[PDB]
Amino acid sequence: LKPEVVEELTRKTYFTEKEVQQWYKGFIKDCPLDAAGFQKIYKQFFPFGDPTKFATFVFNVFDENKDGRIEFSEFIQALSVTSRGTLDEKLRWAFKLYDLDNDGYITRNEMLDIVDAIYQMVGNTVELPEEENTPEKRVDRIFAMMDKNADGKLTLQEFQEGS
Amino acid sequence: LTRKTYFTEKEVQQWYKGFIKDCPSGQLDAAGFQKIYKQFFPFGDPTKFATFVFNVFDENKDGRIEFSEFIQALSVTSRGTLDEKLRWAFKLYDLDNDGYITRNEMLDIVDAIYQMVGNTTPEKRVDRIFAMMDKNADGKLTLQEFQEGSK
Ligand SMILES: [Ca+2]
Ligand SMILES: [Ca+2]
Ligand SMILES: [Ca+2]
Ligand SMILES: [Ca+2]
Ligand SMILES: [Ca+2]
Ligand SMILES: [Ca+2]
């Protein structure tokens, strides 16, 4: 399966032509997916807190062409940046998660929406440790630091340098 | 025939329907469990935490998740009492299954959580909660110390 797609998903991911095949072999086999399916599979296999919120945010970054499904092209490239990507690409990858409305800015409420979604999964359970502060207070501390010009919005540059 | 779980036998029918809908082979192994965690945390490396969680699901430790282990795990974690939820979590921390949670084991859990999201310290954090829960200061955590310490 997969012919000259492998060559293409090699130049865009820096995975080898041996790794792209195994990830496809594993993609259609194993466990699996639309938004509903990914959301419920996240609830089943990650039984700590409520992964409902974060599952939605993650799915939307996965589904780049916004068709309601995660094709192999989107999955292998998303996996690429976090595992093989440069620091710049990784911070830009994190930026898309926070930038909910995709306008090139991170607002205080946008960052709060992400932090709180993560907080509900591992930060607020009685089973897993963490945190020490609150998504309310953590975002205020980090926003005050990164927002150099204090305009209430975070650019990619402010986000990158702050990190 | 598992009336032994907080599910009705009307709910059990539906969960098997969903099980064979997910993994039709009836056996999701470590590799399959590992890659979906890659999906659940595409901002780091969920490898460590995926392994730990998988070991708690797979109760008989054969490297596979049968329906029996899957249906019992969902029960305790989603509908179980606080003690039962804390007891199920205890197995996660207790890596070597000796009935204790040691300092490095909990550190192994926290950093595993730290590694999966670490882009968007574990040392100072573990010292804080371990000192709190370990009442007799023997360097080990019992289920009782863990349960009371969490509440
Ligand atoms: Ca898509
Ligand atoms: Ca925005
Ligand atoms: Ca700004
Ligand atoms: Ca098993
Ligand atoms: Ca132990
Ligand atoms: Ca003790």
Residue numbers in the entry:
A (entry chain D): 8 to 39, 43 to 173
B (entry chain A): 16 to 135, 144 to 174
Give me lines lifted from the publication on this model.
Neuronal calcium sensor-1 (NCS-1) is the primordial member of the neuronal calcium sensor family of EF-hand Ca2+-binding proteins. It interacts with both the G-protein-coupled receptor (GPCR) dopamine D2 receptor (D2R), regulating its internalization and surface expression, and the cognate kinases GRK1 and GRK2. Here, we report the determination of the crystal structures of Rattus norvegicus NCS-1 in complex with peptides derived from D2R and GRK1, as well as the structures of NCS-1 alone and in a C-terminal truncated form. Consequently, in the Ca2+-bound state, NCS-1 folds in such a way that the two lobes are oriented to jointly present a large, solvent-exposed, concave hydrophobic crevice onto which peptide, proteins, and other hydrophobic molecules can dock and bind.
To investigate this phenomenon further, residues Ser-178–Val-190 were deleted to create a C-terminal truncated mutant, NCS-1ΔCT. The solution behavior of NCS-1ΔCT was significantly different from that of the full-length protein. Size exclusion chromatography-multiangle laser light scattering analysis showed that NCS-1ΔCT was polydisperse, with a molecular mass between 29,300 and 42,000 daltons, compared with that for the monodisperse full-length protein of 21,880 daltons. We infer from these results that without the C-terminal region the NCS-1 hydrophobic binding site is completely exposed, causing the protein to self-associate. NCS-1ΔCT crystallized as a symmetrical homodimer with the structure resembling a pair of clasped hands, with the “fingers” of one hand inserting into the “palm” of the other. The palm is the hydrophobic ligand-binding crevice, and the fingers are formed by hydrophobic residues positioned on the surface of the one subunit in such a way that they slot snugly into the hydrophobic crevice of the other subunit. Hydrophobic residues from helix 3 and the EF1/EF2 loop (residues Phe-49–Phe-58) bind to the N-lobe site; residues Val-136–Pro-139 in the EF3/EF4 loop region bind to the C-lobe site. The protein-protein interface buries a large area of about 1854 Å, which means that nearly one-third of the surface of each subunit forms the interface in the homodimer. First, it serves to occlude the hydrophobic binding crevice in the absence of a partner protein and to prevent protein self-association and nonspecific interactions.
